[PDB]
């Protein structure tokens, strides 16, 4: 009999694998069962080890002599999957085959320390106007994404990726970065649309596939955090700026919950155990930039937060807030009120910081946000509307103009400098006479006029990154022509 590195299934049920043997086997290793089921055990009993069925083990009858392969979780590294659809088990995702990724990186990846961290300065390709406007994401940022059923969360992600994939398809020396985003707890139709669009949006050019299906194993859901952590670390220690998207996050929480529940481990609040801090923050705290010493790569993370009827007090959300260097509040009623983007702005917040903020776009946002708050400051008064104080009326119109500009287009990333220019025109007051219902098409048409003509001045500002008063005036006049001529 084996009692060092091979166990024999003692008593099971619902994949509750506690085998007799492999007592001397190491802890936290994905080992093959007697049915060859490469699976991991954690609950090392005095007499046995609680092994998680790495998926469904219907091919494993009771009494099975599981051979503890002594093999810990190891997953590939390197940008070979950028554009390729693969699953975390070394399998494909869309059936996109071998990404040309050979290696496998053991679960032994730790988060970077303060020294191993790097100051974040990358203005994120957000493809959503207010996204870059109010607060883009730093080089390796950490911002929550609060949302609900079909909330456009993945749609905001698509705007970002479409802004991102261009440089992912592109080469901008500071924009050279790695991309990987999870579709966790995803329906087959959803994931198929994801792959198909990644092709269509050309996002299947430089993106490493991440997703947990609805049929994805709960242990697979759990390792997916670690999976993405190692995947990001690949290019991050490879100096390439990287991105994570814990999308979703709560699903794996319920997963490990069911796991320990079978394990009869203590439930905790909402049956959620401390790993919501421990296991979840174990990946979460790494949302930073690998130092120039740590490669100089950036480890961005884009966790997804399900607002279960706005379960603001979710222990999940509880940990998130205490961990959030940023969050995505969404005024979903606004989308329901037609305003899609449905920005919960005064609600929205980001603690990552402005070290990754275009001082041009920063200059724009400095007034845009103040005006937005001031509008929001008395936006209740807008209800009556009548007898609006002239200062109040003007503040409202600026806010009214912004509300016209508040919307966003699905899978429609744009130039960040274009939004900077639009906000600048507003700052000129150059939009004060545009009817808000039409002011949107106005800004769009002026945008077209620039992207044809002032596209020269557009690149001038862009490569410049410095708002020459003359270049500013040139854009102002191009816009004035476009708009007065609109």
């Amino acid at each position: 009999v084996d009692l060092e590195e091979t166990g024999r299934v003692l008593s099971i049920g619902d994949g509750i694998a506690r085998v007799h043997g492999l007592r001397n086997v190491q802890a936290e290793e994905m080992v093959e069962f007697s049915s060859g089921l490469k699976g991991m055990s954690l609950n090392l009993e005095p007499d046995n080890v609680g092994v998680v069925v790495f998926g469904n083990d219907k091919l494993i009858k009771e009494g099975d002599i599981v051979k503890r392969t002594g093999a810990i979780v190891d997953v590939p590294v390197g940008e070979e999957l950028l554009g390729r659809v693969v699953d975390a088990l070394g399998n494909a995702i869309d059936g996109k085959g071998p990404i040309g990724s050979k290696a496998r990186r053991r679960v032994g990846l730790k988060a970077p320390g303060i020294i191993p961290r790097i100051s974040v300065r990358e203005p994120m390709q957000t493809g959503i106007k207010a996204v870059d406007s109010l607060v883009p994401i730093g080089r390796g940022q950490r911002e929550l994404i609060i949302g609900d059923r079909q909330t456009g969360k993945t749609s905001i992600a698509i705007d970002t990726i479409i802004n991102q994939k261009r440089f992912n398809d592109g080469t901008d020396e500071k924009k050279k970065l790695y991309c990987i985003y999870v579709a966790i707890g995803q329906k087959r139709s959803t994931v198929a649309q994801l792959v198909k669009r990644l092709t269509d949006a050309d996002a299947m050019k430089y993106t490493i596939v991440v997703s947990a299906t609805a049929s994805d194993a709960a242990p697979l859901q759990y390792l997916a955090p670690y999976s993405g952590c190692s995947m990001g670390e690949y290019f991050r220690d490879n100096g390439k700026h990287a991105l994570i998207i814990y999308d979703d996050l709560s699903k794996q929480a319920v997963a490990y919950r069911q796991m320990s529940l079978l394990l009869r481990r203590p439930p905790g609040r909402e049956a959620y155990p401390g790993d919501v801090f421990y296991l979840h923050s174990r990946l979460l705290e790494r949302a930073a930039k690998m130092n120039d010493a740590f490669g100089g790569g950036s480890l961005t993370a884009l966790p997804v937060i399900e607002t279960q009827a706005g379960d603001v007090s979710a222990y999940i959300p509880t940990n998130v807030i205490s961990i959030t260097d940023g969050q995505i509040f969404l005024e979903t009623e606004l989308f329901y009120k037609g305003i899609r983007p449905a920005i919960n702005v005064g609600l929205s917040v980001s603690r990552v910081g402005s070290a990754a903020q275009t001082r041009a776009m920063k200059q724009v946002a400095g007034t845009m946000k103040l005006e937005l708050a001031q509008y929001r400051e008395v936006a209740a008064f807008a209800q009556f509307g009548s007898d609006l104080d002239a200062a109040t009326q003007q503040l409202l119109s600026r806010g009214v103009r912004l509300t016209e500009l508040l919307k966003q287009g699905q899978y429609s990333p744009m130039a960040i400098e274009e939004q900077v220019a639009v906000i600048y025109a507003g700052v000129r007051g150059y939009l004060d006479k545009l009817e808000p219902s039409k002011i949107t098409k106005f800004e769009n048409a002026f945008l077209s006029h620039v992207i044809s003509q002032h596209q020269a001045l557009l690149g001038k500002i862009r490569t410049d990154g410095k708002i020459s008063e003359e270049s500013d005036a040139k854009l102002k006049e191009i816009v004035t022509n476009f708009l007065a001529g609109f």
């Binding site: 091919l59 009494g63 329906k187 087959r188 649309q193 609805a214 319920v254 699905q410």
Partner: protein
């Protein structure tokens, strides 16, 4: 081997079998019971007796009852041949017609659609439904969740939609009374007899009967999920016909696995469900749909019992519901009939790239207008239409009219709703939408638009009112 009754408070039974425990999904029949009592081996506890999922009443059993070990899940024939009678998941034809034997017979435990081999497109499976087309047009073979409550129109709108579409299914079809009323069972039998999409004596059965009734305990009532998945796989290949699938209801079904978990001693979820009750239900949602050789236009009922909108059960429901059918039981309380939650349900065919820019834009503007309706409703509750602004009183009337034009009384509903059904044309719907955007009845009463079909028909109704005034 052969299990023998050992020690159990009922169905949570490890039956003493001379050899070990069979493989997973093993469902074995109780030798020595009143009826054919197939019990599912479910707890790999070993001990030559596995705590097994018995779907039948355990009463009368004596300890030591030696039972017939089968070793796998229930095997019964499938394909469009079995259509025409009403059979159990065990195959038991409960149509009082004996075994309606088909060809394709197999076990039920199986995998989901492949990571590369399913269907990758969405085709609007239009049916001409007033509200549904108006905002949330459906699509072909997707996960459409019918968010409705108990006695909340789910069966009523179900009868209307069955009358609408079921008579003309793309191929054959299937319908499951999963915990439906036995009275509803007999009534639905009479209805199928009077429905022709499935014909009792006649071979007009473009539909398949199935029952998981409430008086049937969970052991069966919780088990028909795999039966439905296999039937959908058959309609994909074996029955091989363009099939919409009816199954109601799953709330008591997932709750039934929940109740089973206690006998399993399985961990209570937030609603006390099995911790992996979600795992199965999501996997249950992953089995058979539109694929290369697969197709299931299955209709999924999303029961929100106790109207708990954020139910953990509703949570798992929204988790995979590729299409959303959000009822507004408040609207029905307001007399809405249709009564869905308008700005709530999501459907992909409502998109400018999908619905077209015009239709999707119109639907979104309607959502915004109704949002304003709600907003200003309380505003009025403070003040009232005395301060009704020009844009506002206009908005108020327009929103009231939109709500009115939303509903329609059906012919099957004409049993109660009196007014027979109006086959709403899509172009007619969009045209009425555009006209309302213009204000097609500014001088007229919106009450005509209420419970109405075409907007022109509503103009006629308002003229009829002018007569009756």
């Amino acid at each position: 081997t052969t299990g023998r009754i050992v020690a159990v408070i009922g169905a949570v039974v490890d039956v003493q079998f001379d050899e070990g425990l069979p493989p997973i999904l093993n469902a074995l029949e109780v030798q020595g019971r009143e009826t054919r009592l197939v019990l599912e081996v479910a707890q790999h506890l070993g001990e030559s007796t596995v705590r097994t999922i018995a779907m039948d009443g355990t009463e009368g059993l004596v300890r030591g009852q030696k039972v017939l070990d089968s070793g796998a899940p229930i095997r019964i024939p499938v394909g469009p041949e079995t259509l025409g009678r009403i059979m159990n998941v065990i195959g038991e034809p409960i149509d009082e017609r004996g075994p309606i034997k088909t060809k394709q017979f197999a076990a039920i435990h199986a995998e989901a659609p492949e990571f590369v081999e399913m269907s990758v497109e969405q085709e609007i499976l239009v049916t001409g439904i007033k509200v549904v087309d108006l905002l949330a047009p459906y699509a072909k073979g997707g996960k459409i969740g019918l968010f409705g409550g108990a006695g909340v129109g789910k069966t009523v709108l179900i009868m209307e939609l069955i009358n609408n579409v079921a008579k003309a299914h793309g191929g054959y079809s299937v319908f499951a009374g999963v915990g439906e009323r036995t009275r509803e069972g007999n009534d639905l039998y009479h209805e199928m007899i009077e429905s022709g999409v499935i014909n009792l004596k006649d071979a007009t059965s473009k539909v398949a009967l199935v029952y998981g009734q409430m008086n049937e305990p969970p052991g069966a009532r919780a088990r028909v999920a795999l039966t439905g998945l296999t039937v959908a796989e058959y309609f994909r290949d074996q029955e091989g016909q363009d099939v919409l699938l009816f199954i109601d209801n799953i709330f008591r079904f997932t709750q039934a696995g929940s109740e089973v978990s206690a006998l399993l001693g399985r961990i209570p979820s937030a609603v006390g469900y099995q911790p992996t009750l979600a795992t199965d239900m999501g996997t249950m949602q992953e089995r058979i749909t539109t694929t290369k050789k697969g197709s299931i236009t299955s209709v999924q009922a999303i029961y929100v019992p106790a109207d708990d909108l954020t139910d953990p059960a509703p949570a798992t429901t929204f988790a995979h519901l590729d299409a959303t059918t959000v009822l507004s039981r408040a609207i029905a309380e307001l007399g809405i009939y249709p009564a869905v939650d308008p700005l709530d349900s999501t459907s992909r065919i409502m998109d400018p790239n999908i619905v077209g820019s015009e239709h999707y834009d119109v639907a979104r503007g309607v959502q915004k207008i109704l949002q304003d309706y709600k907003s200003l409703q309380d505003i009025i509750a403070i003040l009232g239409m005395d301060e009704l602004s020009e844009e506002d009183k206009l908005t108020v009337s327009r929103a009231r009219k939109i709500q009115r034009f939303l509903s329609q009384p059906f012919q099957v509903a004409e049993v109660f709703t009196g007014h027979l059904g109006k086959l709403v044309p899509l172009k007619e719907t969009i045209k009425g939408f555009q006209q309302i955007l213009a204000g097609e009845y500014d001088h007229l009463p919106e009450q005509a638009f209420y419970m109405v079909g075409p907007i022109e028909e509503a103009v006629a109704k308002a003229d009829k009112l002018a007569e009756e005034h």
